[PDB]
Amino acid sequence: SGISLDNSYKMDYPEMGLCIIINNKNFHKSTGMTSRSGTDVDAANLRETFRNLKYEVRNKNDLTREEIVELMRDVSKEDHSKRSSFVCVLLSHGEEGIIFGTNGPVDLKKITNFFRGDRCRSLTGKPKLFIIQACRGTELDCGIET
Amino acid sequence: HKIPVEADFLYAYSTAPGYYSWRNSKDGSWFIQSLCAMLKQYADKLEFMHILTRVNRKVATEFESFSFDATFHAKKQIPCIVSMLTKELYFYHLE
Amino acid sequence: XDXFX
């Protein structure tokens, strides 16, 4: 055939891939963490947006740290051979490098490590997108007038 | 013959390292509101990093916090695109 | 209302 370029990911597999949305709104009373008013609007907005991009959206609400790890572990062990990509959206409280389950923190590295090129072979070479709505610390941006 | 195990990840963070990330009780978080709006408008016509750059501009320019506590009032937010991708990403393809 | 994560 003619000249071929390799500059863009192949996104015409039979499936676009999974879009896992972890929507943590209500936290265990034990933790002292406040409910995240407005996060259901986000979760619905994301579900509709990625539906129109032809992702298989799975919405999960109010997961413990153990359930987040088990979910990620299970999803990473699925056969993604027929899928172009993978998307995970995390909506929760957070700190730098950390997302909160309903009962305490999860290292983001623990979540993303399941999808490493050597650990999720049916996603090797495919884009793995992690969209993270959470704080990354306590600094405040005062802005500057333009 | 090998690729890095960390290659082909994209982390679309809602805020810069070290910073708070703001959320509205009625409209959702500033970042997710803006991400969804820009995907809806541009996913059939722009590469993903260029979509996310529009998200950065929308969050940066169109939002500012309102708080009864002066400590948290009139604050701004910039999201943070962290790309280990090795190729351009288009959500559409040629039929 | 604004409120953060």
Swiss-Prot record, chain A:
Domain of life where this protein originates: Eukaryota
Organism: Homo sapiens
Catalytic residue positions: H93, C135
UniProt-recorded name of the protein: Caspase-3 subunit p17
Residues where S-nitrosocysteine is found: C135
Gene: CASP3
